[PDB]
Amino acid sequence: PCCELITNISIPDDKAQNALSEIEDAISNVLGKPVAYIMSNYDYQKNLRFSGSNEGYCFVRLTSIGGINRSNNSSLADKITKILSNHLGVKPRRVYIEFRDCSAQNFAFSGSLFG
Amino acid sequence: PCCELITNISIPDDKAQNALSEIEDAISNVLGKPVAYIMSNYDYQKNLRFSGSNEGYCFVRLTSIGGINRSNNSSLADKITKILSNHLGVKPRRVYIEFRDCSAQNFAFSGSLFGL
Amino acid sequence: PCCELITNISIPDDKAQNALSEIEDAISNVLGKPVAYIMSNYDYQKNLRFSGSNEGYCFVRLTSIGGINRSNNSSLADKITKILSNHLGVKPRRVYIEFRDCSAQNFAFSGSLFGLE
């Protein structure tokens, strides 16, 4: 899976990676996938807006080959938002998460398709 | 909705905000969705290329739960491209816009899915 | 097409430009799309992680109006991974590539939707 965090909250690199490590653990747990398959990123975007304001906010795009369904989506939405709130101080009502399914024929690793 | 502007054009933060604000209003006008539901971003990407060159360029990805259709896309393509040319000085022929539909079951806010 | 490279590998601007140009040429060759239609980017993301670490890694998202299929995806996976390994020194095992199809009706250029309809 790939987890893209985009946020206007600035924290030091060690803290950023801490938050990602916890998000990686949640993804691994919920999707039943090893850490070996998980990409994550903390993208600091100073001009990011939500509801017409530059107040602290997070957007997460989570892309996975399978595992995108109501049960997993709900569980991860809860867990990821909690992590972001705790680690970044963001209000839960300023956290958006998008879930994307990708087919194995449309994803490559080490120069070859998964499918 | 989410409106991601990716550009190699650099303007100060307040002016970046101003440009995004105008885009939000266009989105609100066309989709009928108030700014309360709209995320926007100005991502300065110095190495961004289009048509084989580093000339001033903008890519916009607009993701929305519904309202992705020919009439709405056509209207927003026109409006957003004009806003970018006005505020960033980008040539119309160096503006790409992608429209993405997303299901409510695949989108979460405040720790919960949008879908029932 | 749009080719978004996201990486924690730092290289000089001119070298990033060189790498993107080669990726463009590969996309053009496989998909048949002119360079005139290709957007590309090198997004340096210092905290990008894969497999639990900040070790050298590349993620590429390639979006195109058509041309997304087994044969094209396979060929570009090979070509792009080789370019990245050559230019950035990334190991192939730390290169992910996602392929995305988009309808012409959902894509605009110069303020107008692509296609006729």
Side-chain angles (χ1 to χ4, degrees), chain A residues 6-10 44-58 90-91 94, chain B residues 12-14 16-18 20-21 24 35 38-42:
Chain A
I6 300 158
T7 180
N8 55 17
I9 296 154
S10 185
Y44 175 60
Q45 293 292 311
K46 60 183 176 181
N47 287 310
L48 181 63
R49 294 162 60 89
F50 179 66
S51 187
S53 100
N54 190 225
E55 268 209 317
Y57 166 86
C58 304
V90 69
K91 293 160 164 182
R94 289 185 70 81
Chain B
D13 292 340
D14 58 305
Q17 296 292 290
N18 287 355
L20 294 180
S21 186
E24 290 165 355
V35 78
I38 301 167
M39 170 277 253
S40 70
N41 191 47
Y42 190 118

Tab-separated table of all heavy atoms in Angstrom, chain A residues 6-10 44-58 90-91 94, chain B residues 12-14 16-18 20-21 24 35 38-42:
chain	number	residue	atom	x	y	z
A	6	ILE	N	-0.534	14.632	3.507
A	6	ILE	CA	-0.303	16.004	3.081
A	6	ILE	C	-0.868	16.897	4.176
A	6	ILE	O	-2.039	16.789	4.528
A	6	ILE	CB	-0.976	16.294	1.717
A	6	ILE	CG1	-0.417	15.352	0.642
A	6	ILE	CG2	-0.779	17.759	1.304
A	6	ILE	CD1	-1.317	15.158	-0.569
A	7	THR	N	-0.026	17.767	4.723
A	7	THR	CA	-0.416	18.577	5.874
A	7	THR	C	0.330	19.911	5.927
A	7	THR	O	1.447	20.035	5.416
A	7	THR	CB	-0.239	17.799	7.212
A	7	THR	OG1	-0.622	18.634	8.315
A	7	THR	CG2	1.201	17.346	7.393
A	8	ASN	N	-0.313	20.902	6.537
A	8	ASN	CA	0.275	22.224	6.728
A	8	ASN	C	0.859	22.374	8.140
A	8	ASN	O	1.187	23.479	8.571
A	8	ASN	CB	-0.771	23.313	6.447
A	8	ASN	CG	-2.034	23.147	7.286
A	8	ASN	OD1	-2.036	22.432	8.287
A	8	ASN	ND2	-3.115	23.803	6.872
A	9	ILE	N	0.969	21.252	8.852
A	9	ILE	CA	1.583	21.233	10.185
A	9	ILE	C	3.047	20.832	10.070
A	9	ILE	O	3.373	19.761	9.555
A	9	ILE	CB	0.828	20.308	11.169
A	9	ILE	CG1	-0.588	20.845	11.417
A	9	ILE	CG2	1.576	20.194	12.509
A	9	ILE	CD1	-1.594	19.779	11.808
A	10	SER	N	3.917	21.715	10.548
A	10	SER	CA	5.353	21.493	10.535
A	10	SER	C	5.833	20.846	11.836
A	10	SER	O	5.625	21.389	12.922
A	10	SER	CB	6.082	22.824	10.312
A	10	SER	OG	7.476	22.620	10.175
A	44	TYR	N	4.933	18.168	3.830
A	44	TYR	CA	4.649	19.470	4.418
A	44	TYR	C	4.269	20.492	3.345
A	44	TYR	O	5.096	20.886	2.509
A	44	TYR	CB	5.830	19.975	5.258
A	44	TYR	CG	5.614	21.377	5.792
A	44	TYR	CD1	4.539	21.663	6.639
A	44	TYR	CD2	6.472	22.420	5.440
A	44	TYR	CE1	4.321	22.953	7.118
A	44	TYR	CE2	6.265	23.725	5.923
A	44	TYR	CZ	5.189	23.976	6.760
A	44	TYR	OH	4.970	25.249	7.240
A	45	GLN	N	3.007	20.910	3.381
A	45	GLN	CA	2.473	21.852	2.400
A	45	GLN	C	1.930	23.083	3.119
A	45	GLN	O	0.780	23.099	3.565
A	45	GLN	CB	1.403	21.165	1.543
A	45	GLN	CG	1.969	20.067	0.628
A	45	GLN	CD	2.856	20.630	-0.468
A	45	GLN	OE1	2.481	21.577	-1.149
A	45	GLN	NE2	4.041	20.052	-0.637
A	46	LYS	N	2.779	24.104	3.242
A	46	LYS	CA	2.500	25.270	4.096
A	46	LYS	C	1.210	26.025	3.734
A	46	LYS	O	0.544	26.593	4.610
A	46	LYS	CB	3.704	26.227	4.111
A	46	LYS	CG	4.099	26.772	2.739
A	46	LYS	CD	5.336	27.663	2.804
A	46	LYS	CE	5.756	28.100	1.405
A	46	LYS	NZ	6.980	28.959	1.395
A	47	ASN	N	0.852	26.010	2.452
A	47	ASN	CA	-0.305	26.760	1.968
A	47	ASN	C	-1.596	25.941	1.866
A	47	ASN	O	-2.596	26.406	1.311
A	47	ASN	CB	0.031	27.431	0.630
A	47	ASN	CG	0.961	28.622	0.798
A	47	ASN	OD1	0.719	29.503	1.627
A	47	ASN	ND2	2.036	28.652	0.017
A	48	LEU	N	-1.577	24.729	2.415
A	48	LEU	CA	-2.751	23.845	2.383
A	48	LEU	C	-3.945	24.472	3.100
A	48	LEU	O	-3.813	24.981	4.214
A	48	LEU	CB	-2.409	22.487	2.998
A	48	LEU	CG	-3.453	21.365	3.067
A	48	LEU	CD1	-3.909	20.893	1.687
A	48	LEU	CD2	-2.854	20.207	3.850
A	49	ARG	N	-5.105	24.434	2.449
A	49	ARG	CA	-6.321	25.019	3.003
A	49	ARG	C	-7.429	23.987	3.138
A	49	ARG	O	-7.512	23.044	2.351
A	49	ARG	CB	-6.831	26.154	2.114
A	49	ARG	CG	-5.928	27.363	2.044
A	49	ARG	CD	-6.273	28.218	0.830
A	49	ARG	NE	-7.651	28.717	0.836
A	49	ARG	CZ	-8.043	29.860	1.400
A	49	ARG	NH1	-7.167	30.630	2.034
A	49	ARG	NH2	-9.322	30.235	1.331
A	50	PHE	N	-8.271	24.185	4.146
A	50	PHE	CA	-9.520	23.455	4.276
A	50	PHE	C	-10.548	24.368	4.925
A	50	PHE	O	-10.218	25.120	5.852
A	50	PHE	CB	-9.346	22.181	5.094
A	50	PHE	CG	-10.621	21.400	5.269
A	50	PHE	CD1	-11.242	20.801	4.173
A	50	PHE	CD2	-11.208	21.278	6.524
A	50	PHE	CE1	-12.423	20.090	4.325
A	50	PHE	CE2	-12.391	20.565	6.691
A	50	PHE	CZ	-13.003	19.968	5.584
A	51	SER	N	-11.784	24.298	4.425
A	51	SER	CA	-12.885	25.157	4.875
A	51	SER	C	-12.520	26.647	4.824
A	51	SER	O	-12.929	27.432	5.681
A	51	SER	CB	-13.376	24.747	6.273
A	51	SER	OG	-14.532	25.480	6.633
A	52	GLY	N	-11.741	27.021	3.811
A	52	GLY	CA	-11.389	28.414	3.576
A	52	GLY	C	-10.341	28.974	4.520
A	52	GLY	O	-10.173	30.189	4.604
A	53	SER	N	-9.629	28.098	5.227
A	53	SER	CA	-8.603	28.550	6.163
A	53	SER	C	-7.330	27.707	6.129
A	53	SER	O	-7.353	26.515	5.799
A	53	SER	CB	-9.152	28.639	7.592
A	53	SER	OG	-8.775	27.514	8.356
A	54	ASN	N	-6.231	28.353	6.503
A	54	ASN	CA	-4.919	27.729	6.587
A	54	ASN	C	-4.650	27.104	7.972
A	54	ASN	O	-3.511	26.763	8.290
A	54	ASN	CB	-3.846	28.767	6.193
A	54	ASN	CG	-2.445	28.166	6.018
A	54	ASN	OD1	-1.467	28.738	6.498
A	54	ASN	ND2	-2.344	27.025	5.328
A	55	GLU	N	-5.698	26.942	8.786
A	55	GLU	CA	-5.583	26.259	10.080
A	55	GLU	C	-5.060	24.837	9.901
A	55	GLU	O	-5.284	24.218	8.858
A	55	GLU	CB	-6.934	26.208	10.796
A	55	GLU	CG	-7.204	27.374	11.737
A	55	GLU	CD	-8.129	26.994	12.890
A	55	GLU	OE1	-9.132	26.283	12.654
A	55	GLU	OE2	-7.844	27.402	14.038
A	56	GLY	N	-4.365	24.324	10.919
A	56	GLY	CA	-3.858	22.948	10.911
A	56	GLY	C	-4.836	21.955	10.289
A	56	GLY	O	-5.998	21.877	10.686
A	57	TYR	N	-4.362	21.206	9.300
A	57	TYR	CA	-5.210	20.274	8.558
A	57	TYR	C	-4.385	19.140	7.953
A	57	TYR	O	-3.221	19.343	7.592
A	57	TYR	CB	-6.007	21.035	7.480
A	57	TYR	CG	-6.672	20.156	6.443
A	57	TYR	CD1	-7.938	19.609	6.659
A	57	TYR	CD2	-6.035	19.877	5.245
A	57	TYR	CE1	-8.542	18.794	5.703
A	57	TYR	CE2	-6.625	19.068	4.286
A	57	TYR	CZ	-7.877	18.532	4.517
A	57	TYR	OH	-8.447	17.739	3.545
A	58	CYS	N	-4.987	17.949	7.856
A	58	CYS	CA	-4.354	16.802	7.186
A	58	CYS	C	-5.234	16.189	6.105
A	58	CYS	O	-6.437	15.984	6.302
A	58	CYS	CB	-4.005	15.696	8.183
A	58	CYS	SG	-2.958	16.211	9.523
A	90	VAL	N	-3.587	18.041	15.252
A	90	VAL	CA	-4.663	18.404	14.331
A	90	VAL	C	-6.038	18.034	14.913
A	90	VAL	O	-6.174	17.019	15.596
A	90	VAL	CB	-4.445	17.764	12.929
A	90	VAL	CG1	-4.633	16.242	12.969
A	90	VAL	CG2	-5.356	18.411	11.882
A	91	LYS	N	-7.040	18.876	14.674
A	91	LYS	CA	-8.414	18.541	15.048
A	91	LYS	C	-8.890	17.427	14.125
A	91	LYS	O	-8.638	17.488	12.921
A	91	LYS	CB	-9.336	19.748	14.890
A	91	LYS	CG	-9.070	20.910	15.841
A	91	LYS	CD	-9.685	22.184	15.268
A	91	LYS	CE	-9.813	23.290	16.308
A	91	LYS	NZ	-10.456	24.491	15.687
A	94	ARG	N	-10.508	18.276	10.947
A	94	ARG	CA	-9.652	18.827	9.901
A	94	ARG	C	-8.724	17.724	9.399
A	94	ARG	O	-7.543	17.947	9.123
A	94	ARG	CB	-8.909	20.089	10.382
A	94	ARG	CG	-9.850	21.299	10.543
A	94	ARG	CD	-9.146	22.602	10.894
A	94	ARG	NE	-8.342	23.168	9.804
A	94	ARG	CZ	-8.811	23.894	8.785
A	94	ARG	NH1	-10.108	24.157	8.659
A	94	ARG	NH2	-7.968	24.358	7.872
B	12	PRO	N	4.319	34.606	-3.475
B	12	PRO	CA	4.256	34.652	-2.009
B	12	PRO	C	2.996	34.000	-1.442
B	12	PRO	O	1.984	33.901	-2.144
B	12	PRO	CB	4.272	36.152	-1.709
B	12	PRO	CG	5.004	36.745	-2.883
B	12	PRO	CD	4.485	35.957	-4.047
B	13	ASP	N	3.066	33.573	-0.182
B	13	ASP	CA	2.014	32.760	0.451
B	13	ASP	C	0.607	33.364	0.389
B	13	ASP	O	-0.356	32.669	0.080
B	13	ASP	CB	2.373	32.434	1.909
B	13	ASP	CG	3.567	31.485	2.031
B	13	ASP	OD1	3.897	30.777	1.056
B	13	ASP	OD2	4.176	31.446	3.119
B	14	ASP	N	0.491	34.653	0.695
B	14	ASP	CA	-0.814	35.319	0.710
B	14	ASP	C	-1.451	35.321	-0.686
B	14	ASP	O	-2.660	35.172	-0.821
B	14	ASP	CB	-0.679	36.748	1.225
B	14	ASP	CG	0.277	37.566	0.394
B	14	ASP	OD1	1.439	37.134	0.227
B	14	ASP	OD2	-0.136	38.629	-0.105
B	16	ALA	N	-0.648	33.070	-3.101
B	16	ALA	CA	-0.994	31.666	-3.301
B	16	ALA	C	-2.374	31.375	-2.701
B	16	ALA	O	-3.224	30.774	-3.361
B	16	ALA	CB	0.079	30.753	-2.693
B	17	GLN	N	-2.589	31.832	-1.465
B	17	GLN	CA	-3.874	31.699	-0.765
B	17	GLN	C	-5.016	32.356	-1.533
B	17	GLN	O	-6.104	31.779	-1.652
B	17	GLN	CB	-3.804	32.339	0.627
B	17	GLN	CG	-2.840	31.683	1.593
B	17	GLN	CD	-3.285	30.306	2.014
B	17	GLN	OE1	-4.263	30.151	2.754
B	17	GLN	NE2	-2.569	29.291	1.547
B	18	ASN	N	-4.758	33.570	-2.031
B	18	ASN	CA	-5.746	34.326	-2.802
B	18	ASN	C	-6.194	33.566	-4.041
B	18	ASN	O	-7.392	33.476	-4.325
B	18	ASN	CB	-5.200	35.703	-3.202
B	18	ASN	CG	-5.135	36.674	-2.035
B	18	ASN	OD1	-5.581	36.369	-0.930
B	18	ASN	ND2	-4.569	37.853	-2.279
B	20	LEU	N	-5.951	30.306	-4.565
B	20	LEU	CA	-6.687	29.129	-4.115
B	20	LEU	C	-8.116	29.477	-3.683
B	20	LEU	O	-9.053	28.720	-3.956
B	20	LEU	CB	-5.947	28.421	-2.973
B	20	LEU	CG	-4.593	27.762	-3.258
B	20	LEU	CD1	-4.039	27.119	-1.989
B	20	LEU	CD2	-4.685	26.743	-4.393
B	21	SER	N	-8.272	30.626	-3.021
B	21	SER	CA	-9.588	31.097	-2.588
B	21	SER	C	-10.545	31.289	-3.766
B	21	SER	O	-11.710	30.880	-3.690
B	21	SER	CB	-9.481	32.394	-1.786
B	21	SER	OG	-10.755	32.744	-1.264
B	24	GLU	N	-11.570	27.908	-5.089
B	24	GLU	CA	-12.572	27.350	-4.175
B	24	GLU	C	-13.973	27.877	-4.482
B	24	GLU	O	-14.943	27.115	-4.468
B	24	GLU	CB	-12.219	27.660	-2.710
B	24	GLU	CG	-11.000	26.906	-2.176
B	24	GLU	CD	-10.452	27.489	-0.872
B	24	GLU	OE1	-10.950	28.537	-0.401
B	24	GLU	OE2	-9.509	26.898	-0.318
B	35	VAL	N	-17.482	25.884	0.756
B	35	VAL	CA	-16.053	25.802	1.075
B	35	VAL	C	-15.758	24.938	2.316
B	35	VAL	O	-14.661	24.396	2.447
B	35	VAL	CB	-15.384	27.214	1.167
B	35	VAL	CG1	-15.691	27.902	2.482
B	35	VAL	CG2	-13.880	27.120	0.950
B	38	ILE	N	-14.378	21.869	1.111
B	38	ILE	CA	-13.314	21.983	0.115
B	38	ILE	C	-11.917	22.123	0.726
B	38	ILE	O	-11.660	23.029	1.537
B	38	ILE	CB	-13.570	23.157	-0.873
B	38	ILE	CG1	-14.906	22.963	-1.605
B	38	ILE	CG2	-12.401	23.298	-1.877
B	38	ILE	CD1	-15.388	24.199	-2.341
B	39	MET	N	-11.032	21.214	0.319
B	39	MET	CA	-9.593	21.359	0.515
B	39	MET	C	-8.965	21.889	-0.766
B	39	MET	O	-9.358	21.505	-1.866
B	39	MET	CB	-8.952	20.010	0.887
B	39	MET	CG	-7.417	20.009	0.873
B	39	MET	SD	-6.683	19.761	-0.767
B	39	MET	CE	-6.068	18.087	-0.610
B	40	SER	N	-7.979	22.765	-0.619
B	40	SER	CA	-7.175	23.205	-1.751
B	40	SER	C	-5.713	23.333	-1.339
B	40	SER	O	-5.407	23.508	-0.151
B	40	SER	CB	-7.701	24.522	-2.335
B	40	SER	OG	-7.461	25.611	-1.453
B	41	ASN	N	-4.819	23.239	-2.325
B	41	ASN	CA	-3.384	23.357	-2.087
B	41	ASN	C	-2.620	23.926	-3.272
B	41	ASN	O	-2.970	23.685	-4.432
B	41	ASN	CB	-2.764	22.003	-1.708
B	41	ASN	CG	-1.341	22.143	-1.198
B	41	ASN	OD1	-1.058	22.994	-0.354
B	41	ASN	ND2	-0.433	21.327	-1.727
B	42	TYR	N	-1.567	24.671	-2.950
B	42	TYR	CA	-0.630	25.217	-3.918
B	42	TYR	C	0.706	24.538	-3.631
B	42	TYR	O	1.380	24.860	-2.648
B	42	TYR	CB	-0.520	26.733	-3.711
B	42	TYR	CG	0.225	27.517	-4.781
B	42	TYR	CD1	-0.431	28.493	-5.531
B	42	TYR	CD2	1.583	27.309	-5.019
B	42	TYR	CE1	0.242	29.235	-6.500
B	42	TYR	CE2	2.270	28.047	-5.991
B	42	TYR	CZ	1.593	29.004	-6.727
B	42	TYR	OH	2.262	29.735	-7.687
